[PDB]
Structures are given as C-alpha cells and as structure tokens.
Ligand binder design. Structure first.
Ligand SMILES: CNc1nc(Cl)nc2c1ncn2Cc1ccc(CO)cc1
Length: 164
C-alpha cells in the first residue's frame, strides 16, 4: 500500500538531482550514498536539519525519465571511502568529497511523460522535470511526483520511519 509512503513524505522537502550519467545513479542505488557540488551540499545540509524528511528525486540527463527517489539519512561527511564516481568534463573528484547517506524509497523509473501535469512553483511553474541539479521542489508538487512512481515492493519503509 501507500500509507507508510505518505507518512514518510509528510512535511518532507524535495530536491531534484540531475546526474550526468547512469553509472553514478547505479552506484548510488548499490551503496546508498550521494555526492553533489558544494553549492548544493550546503543546501542539503541546511534542509536535513530543518525537515523530518529530505527527499532526493533523481534524473539522469538525456534519459527522459526519473530513476527513483531516496531520503537523506545523514548530513554530508568526508573521509569515509573513495567513491568511484564517473567524473564528467570539468568535474574533478574534490568537488564530490562530501558524501551523504541515503535510503532508497523507490528504485523504479518514471518517464517524464507521466509528470507533465505537475509544475513546480519554485521554478516559475515550469514542468517539474525542468530544473537544474539541486532545484527545490515545492511540497505539494514533490509529494504528487513521488506518488506517481510505480510501487517498489522490494523496499520496506518500516526502518525508514524509525530513522525519523
Ligand atoms: C555523484 N554526483 C554526480 N554525478 C554526475 Cl555524473 N553528475 C552530477 C553529480 N552531481 C551533480 N551533477 C551534475 C554536474 C554539475 C556540475 C559539474 C561540473 O563540471 C559536473 C556534473
């Protein structure tokens, strides 16, 4: 069912994560970690202290889809292992040393065609698929977007609710 999912999303904050390639999203799903640029790392750390749940919604550039969503379980921390991110052009490894731990809520895909009816007030009411890495998604839009994803029956939200 969706009841525990709705509970997790209650009063959550949502942020759009735009990855340049699938490999980093695959690594994030396997290891439960994410890293972003310093400007967004600061935003996520502020949000983590401010909200009962902080939700990252992932989209690989040019894929035309979202690849799932996850809840921050910690602030960023350095010096814990060297994550073998595939680094885009202009992207060095020192701009990813901040590692957040995340718990996946859904690892299923959602095509952009299914979210065309949702606009984000914090990005000029453009379709929620549109936005830069780190763009915040307003509560109602973010909640409805997460509820569009196919259910991920491999995930038990009981442990996530306890992290809260
Ligand atoms: C592990 N995390 C990430 N993995 C990937 Cl492949 N792209 C990301 C990630 N975070 C943000 N972006 C988009 C971006 C923004 C700025 C530059 C600077 O050249 C490169 C890429």
């Amino acid at each position: 069912g969706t009841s525990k999912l709705k509970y997790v999303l209650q009063d959550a904050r949502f942020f759009l994560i735009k990855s340049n390639n699938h490999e980093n999203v695959s690594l994030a799903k396997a290891k439960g970690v994410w890293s972003t640029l310093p400007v967004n790392e600061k935003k996520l750390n502020l949000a983590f202290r401010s909200a009962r749940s902080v939700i990252l919604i992932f989209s690989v550039r040019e894929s035309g889809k979202f690849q799932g969503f996850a809840r921050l379980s910690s602030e960023s921390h350095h010096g814990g292992s060297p994550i073998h991110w595939v680094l885009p052009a202009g992207m060095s490894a020192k701009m990813l040393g901040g590692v957040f731990k995340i718990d996946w809520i859904c690892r299923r895909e959602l095509p952009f065609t299914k979210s065309a009816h949702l606009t984000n007030p914090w990005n000029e009411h453009k379709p929620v698929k549109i936005g830069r890495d780190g763009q915040e998604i307003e509560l109602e839009c973010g909640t409805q977007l997460c509820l569009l994803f196919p259910p991920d029956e491999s995930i038990d939200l009981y442990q996530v609710i306890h992290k809260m």
